[PDB]
Amino acid sequence: MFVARSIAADHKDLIHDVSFDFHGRRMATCSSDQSVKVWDKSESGDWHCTASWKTHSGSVWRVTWAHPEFGQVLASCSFDRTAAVWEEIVQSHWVKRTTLVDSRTSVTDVKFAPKHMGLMLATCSADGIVRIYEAPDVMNLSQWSLQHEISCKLSCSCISWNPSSSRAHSPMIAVGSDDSSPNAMAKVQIFEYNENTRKYAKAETLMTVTDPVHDIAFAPNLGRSFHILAIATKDVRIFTLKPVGPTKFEIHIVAQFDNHNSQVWRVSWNITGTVLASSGDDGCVRLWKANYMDNWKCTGILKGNGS
Amino acid sequence: KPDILWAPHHVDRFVVCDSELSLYHVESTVLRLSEDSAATLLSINSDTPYMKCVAWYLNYDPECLLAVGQANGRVVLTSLGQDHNSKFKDLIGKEFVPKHARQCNTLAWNPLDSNWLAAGLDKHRADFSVLIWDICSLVTKPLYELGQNDACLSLCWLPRDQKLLLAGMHRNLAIFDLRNTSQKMFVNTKAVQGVTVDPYFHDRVASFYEGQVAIWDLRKFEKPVLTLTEQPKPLTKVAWCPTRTGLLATLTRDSNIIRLYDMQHTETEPTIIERSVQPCDNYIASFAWHPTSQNRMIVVTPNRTMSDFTVFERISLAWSPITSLMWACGRHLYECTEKDIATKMRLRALSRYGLDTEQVWRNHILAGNEDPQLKSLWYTLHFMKQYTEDMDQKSLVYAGIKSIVKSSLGMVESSRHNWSIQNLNEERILALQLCGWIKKGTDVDVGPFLNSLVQEGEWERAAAVALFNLDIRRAIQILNEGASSELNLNVVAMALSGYTDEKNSLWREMCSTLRLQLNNPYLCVMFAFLTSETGSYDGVLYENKVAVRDRVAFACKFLSDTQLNRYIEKLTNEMKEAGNLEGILLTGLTKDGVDLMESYVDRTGDVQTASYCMLQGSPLDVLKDERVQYWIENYRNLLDAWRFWHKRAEFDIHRSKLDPSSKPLAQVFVSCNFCCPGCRKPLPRCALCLINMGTPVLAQFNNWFTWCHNCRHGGHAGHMLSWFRDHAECPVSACTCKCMQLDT
Ligand SMILES: [Zn+2]
Ligand SMILES: [Zn+2]
Ligand SMILES: [Zn+2]
Ligand SMILES: [Zn+2]
């Protein structure tokens, strides 16, 4: 249910990902050529780049954006086992704040936290530990306190958490896996931070997923009574948790779609948590809208180029 | 095994090397080469049996000069070409001769010289192995000749050096210079069965053996820098990608899966990414990259079946607040634009939905689309308001009918009807006013409803209601009056006239069956009412194809107290669990009403109406609940995302005028640095006309006396707006702050 038009953008090497701003103005790209870009749309609708530089002696594949309530901030994951937290200075000088090199193995993911706990970065690294960074004093951005870590005992693949800012929800972390050895067990485990214990303890385990998951994306709360997960292991398995010391949540798998039949690339929920803009390995990446009977049926298809 | 080649200077021609040499031609669409393209074969050659290698003479003209090696060691120059316009006609047919006879394995033309051809021959006791011919003038005169007592197996010209040749011997891996043949650099490896030099780097060479692939460079040339995995089956072909940097295409015997390898970080670890693709479901003989097209492939099965493909993946998605996602595919990004709930709330907000201080029912029309849930809630909310004003002129209505009819006394069951309201106790008229049967006032006649319905065009709703008030000569009159327009109701007027009320009268048996064949469901409750066997009110009350408002009135007029409470309580429980907006008529704006609207939000994610509805005169017992205040915050945060800032402000004006308990606070304060009630000092003056802070003298914003929060340098609100239009520095000398441009 769309008309596809190709944007007028030119990145040097092969692109990796696109993040997006809050109000819907400025993205951030990557390449296997150690380059990033930010394109502010003109009032006429045209896109023009405004900055670029060299990132690291490897490839940067997980650039990300921040919230305007802290100014302007970016971050990225690369070969250097560090997060490039670069802010804007105003022709603008995009250099400030130090690196976060604290990982012995390769970093897997990099994402920010909801805007109701301040700045809280988190990074999960390859063969093990997941790691969260915080800084109370946001007047200078070069300080960063770890204070919390985990031990997933597997090759983490993707991270996510729910923007639900309700006072009645404990913050939770969802982790992906990548092990594909000739055995089956777990690939997505859910965490939950406490207050008195101050520990992210383990609560649940989706014991029906065994394929090499590639991305995890919660659905924004917006006011529902339950959360929504999203996996890309073998078939866009949209899960659904419901609370009923751990919070024993009843699981109800409401999605199994074979359309990709692939190693599906990425999954990304929308602003209001209704349309699941999915993607995959083979070809055109579809949508999965909603129906009157709470039915998840594909409602659009658009091809990787001029379609 | 058969191999496939492309035309170096043609984008639409390829040849298949097999038992016979065949040239094809790609044609468009709208032999099925592709799902959107097909093949158009042009020429056949079969003169040379026992072909062992095929190579292409890469020049701009002739168009199809092909070099073919045989099992006797003689390279034969053959052409398929086109309508001959011979420019070098002497060249065709010039088969070469080696001075003995052996197998010919590998062939390669010189990319730069364009006229030196290299041939590799198997081993012989006392003769040359690699022979460098020069096809410029049956010429058995090699221009060079190397490798006494050895057997070559792979050949490849180096790109940078003009005359350098890389060769793979039996256990020698030598790089030969063609200026002095006394010397050569070499290693002793096992991965010799194929040699490739990548185009871009042109310093890394890849070679393979059995099932293992090795990677070298020409700057160290000592040991294999990188290696791969011991795949349990032999390899057949390896080739780099000539348009995308970093791809080791790979094939194995008797399979159908190609493996493409990603190498970006060309001492720690190697960056290796592997993804396998199956272009087709049949076994694969060999493949062929493309020189010009973007990341292309064609494959040929052991049968004659051809095919095609392409090579790109790992797209990423980014969403936008206006519901329009972003593509990302290599050198291309695409955006798609536009019912989704998020899209609707944009137009509803832009139309000032839910902001009327007038006839309230004007909100369902303001919503644009027609939906029964919305076109009923605003009718329900309007009625509760008109009662509150009327009663004030002379609030418990907001509880809902379930609490109103709990104390329903009286309830004397009516006897057999007398076909021809004020005798009901006030609690029942409370339900009748909300439903709309009567108007605000003691009017016992339901005429105002009846006469408003006819002018609205609805005829049946003027019949069902009328004879529900026991009027069977007005019953025909409603159908008689409407029968002049539009037309079967006139015949129904006869049927709807008579009824015998006997025990086995022909009307009763006929009508109970003759009801179910009609479409409109009011006529169903019509017949299902007349035949109701003195209390069998189980058909009319449960035909949920009819509006709940009528069912609330009709159940209230007839059913007794013991029967009413069980029915009204059982309807709300279904109404609440299934999440129906119509339940507000029953549940009201109490704690239960908040519970029901949880289900409505849970299934449609509508926070606009759930926000406005609960703000409607609810008390300080459900408006302070955590649930309701969460919906308000999310809607406000959503509006800030759409950049509809002025619309958010108008919403907070409405919220301020209705809930004073959420008032904002002051953010400004005057703190004199000296103590000015104590220090007797004035605030600073502007930097342009220098008048002090406060002295007097539409356009009234001009003397607003703004400030700066970084440089502590202020002035008159309009004076610097005129000054800042041509400069970008603080007016005050010895200050380097750009006040306006610092925001952006
Ligand atoms: Zn003072
Ligand atoms: Zn200043
Ligand atoms: Zn002034
Ligand atoms: Zn300033």
DSSP string computed for B103-149: -EEEEEE-TTTSSEEEEEE---TTS-SEEEEETT------SEEE-TT
Distances B245 to A17, A32, B261, B290 between C-alpha atoms, Å: 19, 10, 11, 13
Beta-strand pair A145-149/A156-160: unpaired
* CA-atom Rg of chain A in angstroms: 19
- Residues contacting residue A241 through CB under 8 Å, at least 6 positions apart: A190, A204, A226, A227, A228, A229, A249, A250, A251
What's phi and psi for B254, nearest 5 deg?
60, 50
| Tokens read off for B709 | 């929060």
Closest partner residue to B337 among A3, A106, A279, by Cβ? A3
Distances A306 to A160, A225, B35 between C-alpha atoms, Å: 32, 40, 17
Minimum distance, in Å, between the CA of residue A61 and any CA atom of chain B:
11
CB B7 within 8 A of CB B26: no
B676 is in an annotated binding site: yes
Cα–Cα dist B167/A254, whole Å: 60
Method used for this model?
Answer: cryo-EM
Closest partner residue to A24 among B321, B341, B741, by Cβ? B321
Instruction: Find the B732 Cα to ligand 2 centroid distance in Å.
Output: 5
Cα–Cα dist B725/A41, whole Å: 24
Cα–Cα dist B156/B118, whole Å: 9
* Interchain CB distance below 8 Å, A294 and B610: no
CB A177 within 8 A of CB A188: yes
* Residue listed under structure tokens 């308000």: B632
- Collapse the DSSP code of B92 into the 3-class scheme (helix H, G, I; strand E, B; otherwise coil) and give the result: coil
Which residues from chain B sit within 8 angstroms of residue A90, using beta carbons?
Answer: 741-742, 744
Cis peptide before B664 (omega within 30 of 0): no
Instruction: Find the B295 Cα to ligand 2 centroid distance in Å.
Output: 58
CB A30 within 8 A of CB A19: no
Distances B365 to A188, B354, B359, B370, B374 between C-alpha atoms, Å: 48, 11, 11, 8, 9
Cα–Cα dist B151/B569, whole Å: 96
Cα–Cα dist B333/B315, whole Å: 10
| CA-wise closest residue to B348 among B371, B330, B326 | B371
Residue type, A94: W
Instruction: Find the B675 Cα to ligand 3 centroid distance in Å.
Output: 26
> How many degrees, rounded to 5, is the angle at CA B222 between CA B219 and CA B224?
95
Residue type, B486: E
* Interchain CB distance below 8 Å, B638 and A272: yes
Resolution in A: 3.6
Minimum distance, in Å, between the CA of residue A146 and any CA atom of chain B:
26
B716 is in an annotated binding site: yes
| CA-wise closest residue to B601 among A101, A299, A223 | A223
Q: Scanning every residue of chain B, which has its alpha carbon at the shortest distance from the alpha carbon of A28?
A: B318
Instruction: Find the B732 Cα to ligand 4 centroid distance in Å.
Output: 10
Which residues from chain A sit within 8 angstroms of residue B335, using beta carbons?
Answer: 4-7
Per-residue burial over A177-196, b if 16 or more Cβ lie within 10 Å, else e, is beeeeeeeebbbbbbbbeee
* Interchain CB distance below 8 Å, A271 and B271: no
CB-count burial class (<10 Å; 0-12, 13-18, 19+) for B517:
exposed
Per-residue burial over A63-89, b if 16 or more Cβ lie within 10 Å, else e, is bbbbbeeeebbbbbbbbbbbbbbbbbe
| Chain centre distance of CA A291 | 26
* CA-atom Rg of chain B in angstroms: 46
| Chain centre distance of CA A71 | 21
Cα–Cα dist B206/B216, whole Å: 6
- Collapse the DSSP code of B614 into the 3-class scheme (helix H, G, I; strand E, B; otherwise coil) and give the result: helix
What's phi and psi for B479, nearest 5 deg?
-75, -30
CB A208 within 8 A of CB A253: yes
| CA-wise closest residue to B472 among B513, B518, B417, B415 | B417
- Residues contacting residue B594 through CB under 8 Å, at least 6 positions apart: B614, B622, B625, B627, B628
Element at B56 (helix H, strand E): strand B51-56
What's phi and psi for B174, nearest 5 deg?
-110, 145
Q: Is A2 on the interface with B (CB under 8 A)?
A: yes
Q: How many other CB atoms sit within 10 Å of the CB of residue B632?
A: 20
Cα–Cα dist A143/A98, whole Å: 8
| Tokens read off for B331 | 């050198």
Ligand nearest to the CA of B732: 2
- Collapse the DSSP code of B716 into the 3-class scheme (helix H, G, I; strand E, B; otherwise coil) and give the result: coil
Show contacts of B125-133: CB within 8 Å, 24+ apart. B125/B149, B127/B98, B127/B99, B127/B100, B129/B169, B130/B155, B130/B167, B130/B176, B131/B98, B132/B165, B132/B178, B133/B75, B133/B96
Q: How many domains would you assign to chain A?
A: 1
* Interchain CB distance below 8 Å, A223 and B631: yes
Residues B449, B452, B458, B464, Cα dihedral to 10°: 20
* Interchain CB distance below 8 Å, A275 and B598: no
Q: How many other CB atoms sit within 10 Å of the CB of residue B593?
A: 22
CB A304 within 8 A of CB B329: yes
Size of chain B, expressed as the number of residues it contains: 744
Per-residue burial over B342-364, b if 16 or more Cβ lie within 10 Å, else e, is bebbeebbeeebbeeeeebbebb
Cα–Cα dist B526/B536, whole Å: 14
CB A275 within 8 A of CB A288: yes
- Residues contacting residue A295 through CB under 8 Å, at least 6 positions apart: none
Angle between helices B472-482 and B447-454 (to 10 degrees): 20
Instruction: Find the B735 Cα to ligand 4 centroid distance in Å.
Output: 9
| Helical segments of B543-625, H only | 548-558, 561-577, 584-587, 591-604, 608-614
Q: Residue A238 is part of which domain span?
A: 1-243+250-305
- Collapse the DSSP code of B506 into the 3-class scheme (helix H, G, I; strand E, B; otherwise coil) and give the result: helix
